[PDB]
Design a protein around this ligand. Sequence first.
Ligand SMILES: O=C1C[C@@H](c2ccc(O)cc2)Oc2ccccc21
Length: 212
Amino acid sequence: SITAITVENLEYPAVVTSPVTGKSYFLGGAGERGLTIEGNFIKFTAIGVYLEDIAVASLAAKWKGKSSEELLETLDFYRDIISGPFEKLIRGSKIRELSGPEYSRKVMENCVAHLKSVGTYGDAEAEAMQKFAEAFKPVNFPPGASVFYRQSPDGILGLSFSPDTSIPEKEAALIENKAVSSAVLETMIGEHAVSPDLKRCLAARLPALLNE
Ligand SMILES: O=C1C[C@@H](c2ccc(O)cc2)Oc2ccccc21
C-alpha cells in the first residue's frame, strides 16, 4: 500500500533496494529542508527517510493499534525509529545547488549540538565528525544531485554521493561511531527537530503497515 512521494519534482519511490547491503526499504516519509531568510522559507533540499522492511515487525509490538495522531505525539515512537534494530536510508536531493562544504556545515552543526546535548561528544565523536566533513569536501550538489546516509544498526554511518537521485553502487565513506551513526536521523525526526513534515509522514504511513 505505501505510496511514492514527490517533493518539488523530486520523486521518492515507495520502495528501494541497497546496492551496498542488498537490503530493501520502504518509504517512511519525505519532506524538505532549507533556510528561513527574513521570515521567508527558502527551500534547498528534499529529504526522504527509508526504513528497512524488517522495521515493521520490530515496531509492531509497541506501536501496532495506535492512531496516527497518537504516534505523532509520542516521542518514544520516534526514538524506536531512530534507534531501532534495522537499517535506515536517508536520501537528500538538492532543490538549489550547494557545495559539499556548504551543505555539510549545517548538518554537522545540528549533529554536534545533539551529541553535546546528550553527553556523547568526546574525542572519538569529534574525529568521526571531522571524517564526516572530509567526505563532503570534494563533492558538489547541483539541483537533483543527492546524498545517501545509510544508518546501519551496527553503529556505522555509510555515506554515498550521486550526481542525480539514483543510489550509487559504492559508498564514499564509512563513519564508524555509534553516537554519530544516528545523529543525522535524530536531527530530522528526533525530539528537538523543529520541522515536523517527516514526523507527520511517519505517523500517518506506519499504522497501516503495523496492522498487517
Ligand atoms: O538535510 C538537511 C539539509 C540541511 C541544509 C539546508 C540548507 C543549507 O544551505 C545547508 C544544509 O538542513 C537540515 C537541517 C536538519 C535536518 C536535515 C537537514
